[PDB]
Amino acid sequence: AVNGKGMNPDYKAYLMAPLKKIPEVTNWETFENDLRWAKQNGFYAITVDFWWGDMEKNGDQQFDFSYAQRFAQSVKNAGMKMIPIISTHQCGGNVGDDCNVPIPSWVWNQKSDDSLYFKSETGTVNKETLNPLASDVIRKEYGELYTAFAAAMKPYKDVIAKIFLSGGPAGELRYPSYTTSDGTGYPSRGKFQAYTEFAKSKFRLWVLNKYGSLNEVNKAWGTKLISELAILPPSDGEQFLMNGYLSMYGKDYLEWYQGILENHTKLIGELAHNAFDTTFQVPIGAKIAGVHWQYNNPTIPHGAEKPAGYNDYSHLLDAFKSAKLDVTFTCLEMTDKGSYPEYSMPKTLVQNIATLANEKGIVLNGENALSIGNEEEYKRVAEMAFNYNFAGFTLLRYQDVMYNNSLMGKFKDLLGVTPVMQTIVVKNVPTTIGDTVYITGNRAELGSWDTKQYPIQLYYDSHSNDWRGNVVLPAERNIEFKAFIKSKDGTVKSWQTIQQSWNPVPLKTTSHTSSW
Ligand SMILES: OC[C@H]1O[C@H](O[C@H]2[C@H](O)[C@@H](O)[C@@H](O)O[C@@H]2CO)[C@H](O)[C@@H](O)[C@@H]1O
Ligand SMILES: OC[C@H]1O[C@H](O[C@H]2[C@H](O)[C@@H](O)[C@@H](O)O[C@@H]2CO)[C@H](O)[C@@H](O)[C@@H]1O
Ligand SMILES: OC[C@H]1O[C@H](O[C@H]2[C@H](O)[C@@H](O)[C@H](O)O[C@@H]2CO)[C@H](O)[C@@H](O)[C@@H]1O
Ligand SMILES: OC[C@H]1O[C@H](O)[C@H](O)[C@@H](O)[C@@H]1O
Ligand SMILES: [Ca+2]
């Protein structure tokens, strides 16, 4: 893996459940059997959306966790684990959606202003999820929902391996900047979503709080605003993305804009921990979307990310570490293109996000963006997952592998692996002062024969004069590898004489000894 390390020893594979309720897809007995089968193929738990629109439909405080409970009951019967997603967002309207579950219709009546929803540069209204600006309503509603959920699901704490939160549209921490009705669907640039009267005044107050007065504002932005009402979000999103973002005003606007999402992260993170920490004691996480298009568009750089709310990922991730939430990213199955008109750079994006996450010590979990239909995409996922320290991978979605035995068999082999620590020992290595020994192998878990970025470092044992190291490997899988020497300057000097192998790696920790 990266930095001479191996795959993450805590890696686990997860299966994303269907969007529709199980009873609308099959019966509970078949479902329980599907889970036993999934478990046989390396899946540790099934992640599932529990829609707010279902749990509090009737009215405020009128809960119904009957479905969630029945679902957990079957997971328990199958001897599996589940990862509930407290989806406070709407189901339907997004890519891949095949459901229709809006958030409780009554929530919109708790306000007379327009503080609850989103309005784009061109007036398009969006009600897929509560606007994070309304922290007062979110604190109340999410606070109540989470605590009610904890009580109702207390009896099943033993099958709950983790809890996910929905930070926005599609259960992702972001603004709804890419939608069909707003004319911002892939691969178009996104449209900023801060045009409600509430958003405008909030930005105005934030600017005034930062600088004190209009004069200080005009002084900082080098502008000539006539009055406080002139403090506004971009009038022209396109022009802003072309070069307005480079000005002092742009920096402040984007800081505030992304700031709303960071503050929201800290809020839900706190409500969640307060409601689940003592009861379940399981990790909590949220999702960041993979807005990979328009990444390298020369005219409007990061034209889709910025409107989504992603301007500074480093700063964004700090909010997660601060809130004590694990992070989930996507697009692990895709590769870079970066050509007109999409200017798509998913892999580059995933690599950057992963590098940042690992630096800050944030637990990283990945997902695939679109359904996978060929073994080749599983390989791409494997490369990213096992070389960028992912602690987990969640496959979307259920039916894709449940009704396709050959695809399932390929996932079991490449991704449904159980990591096991093994000691590799290489003897008689002709190393000279300054050289370092590494091992690289055929599977992604071994860097796929890469000696530049993904090789696994070994350590000299001065006592037995050989090189060794405890390496994490995929249990019960066949592997081939070779040790090689890296000069002090970083070039590959020589390779092990014979290619080694372990057919397969045993599930018990032992050691593999070979000679150079
Ligand atoms: O609130 C100040 C001003 O902001 C916007 O104008 C920005 C523009 O969006 C940027 O791309 C760049 O040109 O800097 C401008 C400020 O000097 C709003 O469009 C404008 O209405 C508002 O008054
Ligand atoms: O690069 C893929 C390739 O890597 C290894 O081949 C090594 C070989 O082991 C060394 O002795 C020397 O020849 O450099 C080669 C790399 O060019 C694997 O052994 C091989 O299976 C794999 O395809
Ligand atoms: O079931 C989980 C969520 O699935 C969809 O959202 C996915 C989307 O399909 C995928 O392309 C993207 O990369 O990630 C999101 C979030 O996992 C539904 O649209 C969501 O409502 C579900 O919560
Ligand atoms: O915008 C939703 C979807 O748009 C496109 O299909 C992208 O390829 C995909 O990665 C993304 O999830
Ligand atoms: Ca409530």
**Do 439 and 455 form a contact (C-beta atoms < 8 A)?**
yes
> Is residue 144 a known part of a binding site?
yes
Could you give the C-alpha distances from 341 to 183, 331, 337, in angstroms and in order? 16, 19, 10
Residues of the chain with CATH 2.60.40.10: 417-516
User: Looking up tokens 């890296």, which residue turns up?
Assistant: 486
HEC string for 481-493: EEEEEECCCCCEE
For 221, phi and psi rounded to 5 degrees? -85, -5
Task: Give resolution, Å, one decimal.
Answer: 2.1
- Among 240, 242, 254, 256, the mutation site with the greatest number of ligand 1 atoms within 8 A of its Cβ is 240
Q: Which helix (H) or strand (E) holds 48?
A: strand 43-51
Name the nearest CA neighbour of 39 among 14, 9, 72, 18.
Answer: 14
Q: What pairing do the DSSP bridges indicate for beta strands 12-16 and 392-395?
A: parallel
d(CA 42, CA 201): 51
> Is residue 435 a known part of a binding site?
no
d(CA 424, CA 60): 59
Q: What pairing do the DSSP bridges indicate for beta strands 163-165 and 511-515?
A: unpaired
| Joined tokens for residue 254 | 């984007």
d(CA 413, CA 409): 6
Q: What type of residue sits at position 253? A: Y
Helix (H, G, I), strand (E, B) or coil at 165: strand
Name the nearest CA neighbour of 102 among 121, 70, 126, 81.
Answer: 126
d(CA 201, CA 194): 10
244 lines ligand 1 (CB under 6 A): yes
Number of neighbours of residue 434 by Cβ within 10 angstroms: 9
Tell me, in angstroms, the distance from the centre of ligand 3 to residue 23's CA. Answer: 20
d(CA 419, CA 10): 7
Q: Which helix (H) or strand (E) holds 203?
A: helix 197-211
CA 428 to chain centroid, in Å, comes to: 44
Helix (H, G, I), strand (E, B) or coil at 164: strand
Tell me, in angstroms, the distance from the centre of ligand 2 to residue 16's CA. Answer: 37
- Among 89, 95, 101, 292, the mutation site with the greatest number of ligand 3 atoms within 8 A of its Cβ is 95
d(CA 441, CA 443): 6
Helix (H, G, I), strand (E, B) or coil at 435: coil
Helix (H, G, I), strand (E, B) or coil at 207: helix
> Is residue 60 a known part of a binding site?
yes
**Do 348 and 336 form a contact (C-beta atoms < 8 A)?**
yes
- β-partners of residue 513 are 425
For residue 289, give the ligand 4 atom closest to its CA: 12
Angle (nearest 5°) at CA 481 between 478 and 483: 155
240 lines ligand 1 (CB under 6 A): yes
Residues of the chain with CATH 3.20.20.80: 1-416
**Do 126 and 196 form a contact (C-beta atoms < 8 A)?**
no
Protein residues with CB under 6 Å of any ligand 2 atom: 449, 482, 495, 499
Name the nearest CA neighbour of 452 among 428, 419, 486.
Answer: 486
Burial of 373 by CB count in 10 Å (0-12 exposed, 13-18 middle, 19+ buried)? exposed
**Do 115 and 134 form a contact (C-beta atoms < 8 A)?**
yes
> Is residue 200 a known part of a binding site?
no
Q: What pairing do the DSSP bridges indicate for beta strands 43-51 and 81-87?
A: parallel
Spell out the residues 6+ positions from residue 8 whose beta carbon is closer than 8 angstroms to its own: 386, 389, 390, 391, 419, 472
Spell out the residues 6+ positions from residue 67 whose beta carbon is closer than 8 angstroms to its own: 21, 50, 54
User: Looking up tokens 């909010």, which residue turns up?
Assistant: 319
> Is residue 365 a known part of a binding site?
no
User: DSSP label at 91?
Assistant: B
Exposure pattern of 299-317 as b/e (b: 16+ CB <10 Å)? Answer: ebbbbbbbbbbbbebeebb
The superfamily CATH assigns to domain 417-516 is Immunoglobulins (2.60.40.10)
Catalytically active residues are 172, 367
d(CA 56, CA 72): 18
Pick the residue whose CA is nearest to atom 15 on ligand 3: 170
d(CA 405, CA 163): 29
Q: What type of residue sits at position 263? A: N
d(CA 351, CA 334): 12
Q: What pairing do the DSSP bridges indicate for beta strands 459-461 and 456-457?
A: unpaired
Name the nearest CA neighbour of 173 among 319, 302, 50, 275.
Answer: 319
**Do 53 and 122 form a contact (C-beta atoms < 8 A)?**
no
Could you give the C-alpha distances from 364 to 8, 128, 283, 349, in angstroms and in order? 10, 26, 12, 14
- CB-side exposure of 64: number of CA atoms within 13 Å? 11
Q: What pairing do the DSSP bridges indicate for beta strands 492-495 and 511-515?
A: unpaired
Number of neighbours of residue 460 by Cβ within 10 angstroms: 16
d(CA 360, CA 325): 12
**Do 16 and 330 form a contact (C-beta atoms < 8 A)?**
no
d(CA 399, CA 30): 13
Tell me, in angstroms, the distance from the centre of ligand 5 to residue 339's CA. Answer: 47
Q: State the CATH architecture for 1-416.
A: Alpha-Beta Barrel (3.20)
Burial of 475 by CB count in 10 Å (0-12 exposed, 13-18 middle, 19+ buried)? middle
Experimental method: X-ray
Tell me, in angstroms, the distance from the centre of ligand 4 to residue 287's CA. Answer: 15
d(CA 132, CA 144): 17
User: DSSP label at 345?
Assistant: -
Name the nearest CA neighbour of 87 among 56, 50, 54, 55.
Answer: 50
For 119, phi and psi rounded to 5 degrees? -140, 125
- β-partners of residue 439 are 456, 483
| Joined tokens for residue 149 | 């959920």
For 496, phi and psi rounded to 5 degrees? -65, 145
| Joined tokens for residue 114 | 């327009």
Per DSSP (E only), the strands in 359-441 are 364-367, 392-395, 419-427, 436-441
Maximal C-alpha separation, the chain:
79
Angle (nearest 5°) at CA 345 between 374 and 8: 65
Number of neighbours of residue 488 by Cβ within 10 angstroms: 11
**Do 169 and 129 form a contact (C-beta atoms < 8 A)?**
yes
Length of the chain (residues): 516
| Joined tokens for residue 117 | 């929803």
**Do 384 and 332 form a contact (C-beta atoms < 8 A)?**
yes
User: Which ligand is nearest to the Cα of residue 62, counting in written order?
Assistant: 5
d(CA 132, CA 142): 12
Judged by phi (left if over 0) then psi (alpha if -120 to 50, else beta), residue 61 lies in left
Could you give the C-alpha distances from 510 to 297, 332, 423, 478, 480, in angstroms and in order? 51, 32, 6, 15, 17
Protein residues with CB under 6 Å of any ligand 3 atom: 16, 19, 49, 85, 87, 89, 91, 94-97, 170-172, 287, 290, 330, 367, 369, 396
User: DSSP label at 273?
Assistant: H
Angle (nearest 5°) at CA 325 between 170 and 175: 30
| Joined tokens for residue 476 | 């019960």
**Is-cis flag, bond preceding 474, omega within 30?**
no
**Do 187 and 334 form a contact (C-beta atoms < 8 A)?**
no
Q: What type of residue sits at position 199? A: A
| Joined tokens for residue 227 | 């009055």
d(CA 165, CA 172): 9
218 lines ligand 1 (CB under 6 A): no
User: Which ligand is nearest to the Cα of residue 371, counting in written order?
Assistant: 3
- CB-side exposure of 424: number of CA atoms within 13 Å? 27
Q: Which helix (H) or strand (E) holds 172?
A: none
d(CA 57, CA 338): 44
**Do 168 and 174 form a contact (C-beta atoms < 8 A)?**
yes
**Do 152 and 68 form a contact (C-beta atoms < 8 A)?**
yes
For residue 450, give the ligand 2 atom closest to its CA: 1
For residue 242, give the ligand 1 atom closest to its CA: 11
> Is residue 463 a known part of a binding site?
no
d(CA 210, CA 223): 16
- Among 16, 95, 128, the mutation site with the greatest number of ligand 4 atoms within 8 A of its Cβ is 95
d(CA 57, CA 100): 13
Helix (H, G, I), strand (E, B) or coil at 315: helix
Q: Which helix (H) or strand (E) holds 471?
A: strand 466-474
Could you give the C-alpha distances from 61 to 55, 56, 104, 424, in angstroms and in order? 10, 7, 11, 58
d(CA 348, CA 353): 9
- β-partners of residue 468 are 425, 459
